[PDB]
Design a protein around this motif. Structure first.
Motif: not given
Lengths: 257, 125, 253, 253
Positions: A214-221, B44-57, C221-228
C-alpha cells in the motif's frame, strides 16, 4: 533533437560485466499454477514508487542517492499486482533520468551490488569494485541499465523477507555549477522501470487488505476542517515560522507514519 | 426548534428496519447540572465520529444494500453478534427481547460481505 | 420408433456473444488477465443471502449484475484499467437439511428491462434454471454480456445483464421448530472464456469496486458524535424510540 | 448454438509440479518407495476433527500440511531417509444425518502465506472444493508441492503447501436435540504419483514423525508427582480451582 550538444548524450546501456540470469524458467516446474502479467506492462516505462532524488551541490561524494532493491516494489503496477500473488522471479530494466542544466559537472556511479552484502556503509572506495557504470550528471537521454536477479532459491516470496540484487548509486564526484550568477542548479532525477523479458508471479492468493505495498493515502479533507491534536478546537490555519523553537518535543499529536 | 415555530429541511428518521430488528446505539454520558439524582444523562449516536470522518473522507460506492459486520472480539476471536449496517448510516441488529442488552466495548468491527435487504440476521440474546 | 426420456439435466442454452472481438478496433488496448483466474470460482462481494419461512413467494433474494465487481480479483484488477468487456459465470450454493421444501428460480434478466415487479409467473419466461433448497452440490449459470455499446466502462456503472433469483414455491419446513431456520446461501463467480479489460491506467486506488473497510478501532476509544466525550458503550434497546431522527452523526456509506 | 449445463463436478485443477526431477542432481540418492503405498488411502496422524453447532463460521477446523507425516507409512519410512520431495493426495470423510445443514470449504493455502486470520470471504479465493456436511462418499484433493527449495529435509520441519478447512456456512440442525450433535470427520492421505525420499540413512528410531505412545501402566501403580506416595485415584471435579499453577508435575509433550 535538442539544442544543443554541449551536453553528453549517453544513450547506450553501458556494458556491465555480469552474465545473463534465468527468470521464471526456474519456477515454472515448482509453482503449481500458470500465471502471466498483462502484456501491456512490458511495453512502457513508468515511475517507481521511489522515483525522485536530487543532487544538490551540498551533497558530498559518497552520499547514496537512490538505493533500490529488486522486487515488485519498483513499478506502480508490479507493486499493485503483487497483492494477489505470493512470490516473484526474474529480471527488471531500470531507467535513470538525470539531465541537469548544461552548466553543471560531476559524475555518479551505479553499482549492481549482489545479495547477502552487509548493508550499511558502502563507502566510495568499494562502490567501484562491484560491476558498475559511471555516468555524467549532464547526460541528456535516459540511461537504461539492467537489474538482474541473483538468487539461490527458485522464486522469492512476496514478503519483504528475501534478499535480492540491490542497485545503489553514489555521488562519485560532486556536482558543481558554472553559471556566472548566484545560483547552483540542483539536478532533479527520475526513475522509470519496467519488468524484464521474463518477470512473473507464481501462485495466486487472495488480495489481502492490509498488504505490504500500500503506497500511502492521506485523508482528503481540508486542514480547515480537521481537528487539532493539542486542544479541543478546530484547526485555524497552517504556517511555517523559524522564529519559534524549531525542535520541540510535544507529547501530543505525535504518530509515526 | 430551528425556526421560530416553522418547519425546516432535516434528515429523514432512521429507518426502515425489518420485522424483528433494532438499532445499535453508541451511547455516551454528559455533563448534567441538576439536583434530582446521579442518573447521568446518556445520549446515543448512530455511528462514532471516527466513522463519519472516515466515510466522508474515503468515498466508497455501496455495492447492493447493506454490509454484514461481525463484532469479533479483539483477542479470542468470537462472534459477539452479527449486525447489518444499512448503507443509509445505521447498524441494525436482530434483537428479540424487551430489556436493554449491553455489549462489551472492546470489539473490532469487521466486514464480511455485502448483502441485500432481505437478509435474516442471526438473532442475539 | 423413438424414445423420449423423463429426467434430463437443466443446461440453460446460449448463443455466444462476442467479447473483445467487437471492441478491439474502437478501443485503445485490449488487456489479457492472469489466465489462472478463469479456473476457479471465488466468492463475490455480494455473495451472501438467506431464505427463510418468512419469505413469501415472490421476494427477490439476490440481484447480481454482470461486471468486474463479482469476483474479488476483477474487483481488484479493475483499478488499473478503464473498462471491461466480456462474459462471466456464476455459481450458487444452498444449505438445507431434508426438512425444508421449496424451490428457487434464477433467471438471466437482460439489460434495459424495466426494473419493477416480477410476479412468479413472469420470472420463468426468461432463461432460467430451477433449483430447490435441498440440493447439495453447487449449481452454475452462464452470465453472458448482452449489450449494445461496444465495451462498458468501469467507473461508469453501465447497465448490463443481471441475474435475479425468486423464491418460486414458498419455503416451509415440516413441523419441528420452524420460523428460525434461515437457509443460508452463498454465491461465487469466475470470468468466462472471453473476458478482458480494455485500457491500461494508473492504479488510482480511489475508485469504485473496492471493498469497504471499517476503521479498526474499539468503540471505547472512539469519539462520540453528539457530545464531545468518548464513546462509553454500545447497546441495543427496544424500549426507547426505534426510529429517531437525530441530525448529527448521520452519514451514508 | 451451444448449451452450458447447470450442474458439474468440482474437480480442483492443477498444473503439475516436478518431484524428483528437480532434485535428482543436487541430491545424493533418490529412493523409490513400496509401490503399493500409492494405491490406498490411510488415516493420517492428525486425521480427526469435529464440527458442531457451537462453531461460528470462520473457525479453522483442521490445518493439514504436506509432508511424510500424513500417512503412517511415510511417517515410518521417513526415519530411514533424510528428505522427501513430491506431491500427495488427501481425502476427507464427513458424517451427518439429514438433519444437519452447513458447508465447509477446504482450500490449498500455498507456502509463505502469512499465517493469520482468514475471514470466510478470503478462504475461497484459493483453489478449493466446497462440500457440505451431509455428503456421503469421501471427497479428495491433490496436495501439490509448491516450493522453492529443491527438496525438503525431514528433520527440519520445512514450510510447505498446507490444507485448511473453514466452516463456510454455519452448521445448524433442525430442532430436535441440537447443541450435542458433533458431526465427526476423519482424514486420510496417500502419496501422489511423484513422491520419493531422497537419501538413505540408518534408522535412528529417535526422530520426528513417530506417533507418541504413552506408557502402558495402570494409574494405580504409578508414582505421584507432588508427594512420594503411589497414585491413589484419578478424578475430575469442577468445584476445585480449574486453573491451578502447580510447579511440579508439569512437562510438555
Amino acid at each position: 533533437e535538442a539544442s544543443g550538444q554541449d551536453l553528453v548524450p549517453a544513450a547506450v546501456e553501458q556494458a556491465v560485466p555480469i552474465q545473463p540470469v534465468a527468470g521464471a524458467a526456474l519456477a515454472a516446474p515448482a509453482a503449481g499454477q500458470i500465471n502471466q502479467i498483462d502484456p501491456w506492462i512490458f511495453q512502457n516505462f513508468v515511475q517507481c514508487p521511489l522515483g525522485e532524488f536530487s543532487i544538490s551541490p551540498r551533497n558530498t561524494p559518497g552520499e547514496i542517492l537512490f538505493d533500490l532493491a529488486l522486487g515488485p516494489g519498483l513499478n506502480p503496477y508490479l507493486a499493485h499486482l503483487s497483492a494477489m500473488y505470493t512470490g516473484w522471479v526474474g529480471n527488471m530494466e531500470v531507467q535513470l533520468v538525470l539531465a541537469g542544466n548544461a552548466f553543471t559537472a560531476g559524475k555518479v556511479v551505479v553499482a549492481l551490488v549482489p545479495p547477502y552484502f552487509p548493508k550499511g556503509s558502502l563507502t566510495t572506495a568499494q562502490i567501484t569494485c562491484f560491476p558498475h557504470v559511471m555516468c555524467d550528471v549532464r547526460t541528456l537521454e535516459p540511461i537504461q541499465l539492467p537489474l538482474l536477479d541473483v538468487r539461490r532459491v527458485l522464486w522469492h516470496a512476496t514478503q519483504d523477507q528475501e534478499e535480492s540484487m540491490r542497485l545503489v548509486c553514489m555521488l562519485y564526484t560532486p556536482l558543481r555549477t558554472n553559471s556566472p550568477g548566484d545560483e547552483s542548479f540542483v539536478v532533479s532525477g527520475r526513475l522509470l522501470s519496467k519488468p524484464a523479458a521474463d518477470f512473473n508471479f507464481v501462485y495466486l492468493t487472495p488480495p489481502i487488505e492490509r498488504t505490504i505495498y500500500r503506497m500511502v493515502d492521506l485523508p482528503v479533507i481540508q486542514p480547515r476542517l480537521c481537528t487539532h491534536a493539542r486542544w479541543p478546537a478546530p484547526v485555524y490555519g497552517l504556517l511555517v515560522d523559524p522564529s519559534l523553537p524549531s525542535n520541540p518535543q510535544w507529547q501530543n499529536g505525535r504518530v509515526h507514519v | 426548534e430551528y425556526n421560530d415555530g416553522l418547519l425546516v429541511p432535516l434528515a429523514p428518521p432512521i429507518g426502515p428496519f425489518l420485522p424483528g430488528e433494532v438499532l445499535l446505539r453508541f451511547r455516551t454520558y454528559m455533563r448534567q447540572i441538576d439536583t434530582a439524582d446521579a442518573a447521568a444523562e446518556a445520549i446515543d449516536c448512530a455511528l462514532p465520529q471516527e466513522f463519519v470522518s472516515w466515510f466522508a473522507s474515503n468515498a466508497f460506492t455501496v455495492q447492493s444494500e447493506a454490509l454484514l459486520l461481525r463484532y469479533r472480539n479483539t483477542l479470542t476471536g468470537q462472534l459477539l453478534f452479527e449486525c447489518k449496517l444499512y448503507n443509509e448510516g445505521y447498524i441494525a441488529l436482530s434483537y428479540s427481547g424487551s430489556g436493554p442488552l449491553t455489549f462489551p466495548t472492546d470489539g473490532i468491527f469487521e466486514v464480511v460481505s455485502w448483502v441485500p435487504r432481505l437478509y435474516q440476521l442471526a438473532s442475539v440474546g
